[PDB]
Design a protein around this ligand. Structure first.
Ligand SMILES: Nc1nc2c(ncn2[C@@H]2O[C@H](COP(=O)(O)OP(=O)(O)O)[C@@H](O)[C@H]2O)c(=O)[nH]1
Length: 163
């Protein structure tokens, strides 16, 4: 069985845990930072091993391990959090440094899309993802919009990389 090590990175409060809980446990409530579940993606059985991290948590050694062995990364910001969008470049640069590669599978995720407060335009996000050469997916952990698509797209980016 193929295992995919995934890391979900982004500023505190953008909804990394909520997105992963929705994916793995199929619910939303308005704790766990690591998750592990077998799913079927395009007919292929995959074990997803997932860490959520803002890079400010106490277990730095574990974080660095996951960062080094992470095969794909979700770069998460919230559409009502301009600072979290601005932080994305820092996170991408950090991943590139630790992986020591310019071709690391990543997906840009704009979460909280159900909320009417928006300070980051979809155009801004699309433009950034284009510059990085990665997909952009709008999500809501609350409504489930885009949640499977975000993670499954990432798994597909990993497969394309391994080809
Ligand atoms: N309305 C809405 N709230 C969300 C969404 N995702 C997360 N939240 C809320 O945002 C807050 C922070 O989410 P959390 O998963 O803890 O963020 P994390 O620090 O990135 O892991 C919590 O109150 C969540 O309920 C979303 O898509 N929509």
């Amino acid at each position: 069985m193929t295992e995919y090590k995934l890391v979900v990175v982004g500023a505190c409060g953008v909804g990394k845990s909520a997105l992963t809980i929705q994916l793995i446990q199929n619910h939303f409530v308005d704790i766990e930072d690591s998750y592990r579940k077998q799913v079927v993606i395009d007919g292929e059985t995959s074990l997803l091993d997932i860490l959520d991290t803002a890079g400010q948590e106490e277990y730095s050694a574990m974080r660095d391990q996951y960062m080094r062995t992470g095969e794909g990364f979700l770069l998460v910001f919230a559409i009502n959090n301009t600072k979290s969008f601005e932080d994305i470049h820092h996170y991408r640069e950090q991943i590139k440094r630790v992986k020591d590669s310019e071709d690391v599978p990543m997906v840009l995720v704009g979460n909280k899309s159900d909320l009417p407060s928006r300070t980051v335009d979809t155009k801004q996000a699309q433009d950034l993802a284009r510059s990085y050469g990665i997909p952009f997916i709008e999500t809501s952990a609350k409504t489930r919009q885009g949640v499977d698509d975000a993670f499954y797209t990432l798994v597909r980016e990993i497969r394309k990389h391994k080809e």
